[PDB]
């Protein structure tokens, strides 16, 4: 719970710096960009501990990821109040906690899938102001998708939720929890690819399959009840 506190005291710090002061339009929009990455990165630390790869050698290049992505980011703050605030403190911070690597938590996992698509969503309809060529309906295909995968995550956290909170209750279903961690993985490093992607990045998911998968598996194992 450390980068938390950090992150939520930047937001804090950068909150007081827009309410009251005179700073240009385009400044405090650099900023709001600045603190939709902060926020970004909030969903990341505080589900960290369930974002586990099976190979760390892919840590090696999920950090080198962080670290850049991190780095890139940090400049187009003005340097007017870059100075003031402790932007490499915080840097230092997550890099530091983006290194840290029989009971499954199956709340984690879906709140962490919510928060996740929460974000995704919240990125690919912000920046659309830099419009491209009208096959761009591509993206809003893209969203399309996105939005039927959020939704039906809501879908499986209503009809199993009293099977999610209690699942300790259940034993290992190895099928549902490697799909579970798999789609996990999949959606932090896809949330990742779209933070590079909207923000200058220097470097499709197919997650509609994968939480279909997780809603059959969770329909055989959670309807094979006496109800």
Not at 109 to 128: A, P, S, W
């Amino acid at each position: 719970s450390m980068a938390e506190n950090e992150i939520e005291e930047m937001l804090e710090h950068l909150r007081r710096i827009k309410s009251g002061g005179d700073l240009d339009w385009l400044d405090i929009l650099r900023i709001e960009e600045l603190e939709m990455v902060l926020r970004v990165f909030r969903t990341f630390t505080k589900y960290n501990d369930v974002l586990l790869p099976d190979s760390l050698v892919e840590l090696t290049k999920r950090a080198k990821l962080i670290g850049e992505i991190l780095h890139r980011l940090f400049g187009r703050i003005p340097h007017k109040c870059k100075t003031n605030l402790n932007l490499e403190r915080l840097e230092s911070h997550l890099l530091e906690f983006f290194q840290g690597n029989n009971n499954f938590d199956l709340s984690k996992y879906m709140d962490c899938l919510e928060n996740f698509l929460n974000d995704v969503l919240m990125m690919f309809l912000q920046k659309d102001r830099f419009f491209h060529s009208r096959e761009q309906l591509a993206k809003h295909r893209s969203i399309k998708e996105l939005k039927i995968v959020q939704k039906k995550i809501r879908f499986l956290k209503y009809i199993y939720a009293t099977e999610i909170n209690g699942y300790v209750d259940y034993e290992k279903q190895e099928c549902l929890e490697n799909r579970i961690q798999f789609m996990t993985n999949t959606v932090g490093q896809y949330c990742l690819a779209v933070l590079d992607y909207v923000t200058e990045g220097k470097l499709p998911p197919y997650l509609l399959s994968l939480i279909v998968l997780v809603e059959l598996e969770m329909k055989k194992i959670f309807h094979g009840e006496v109800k």
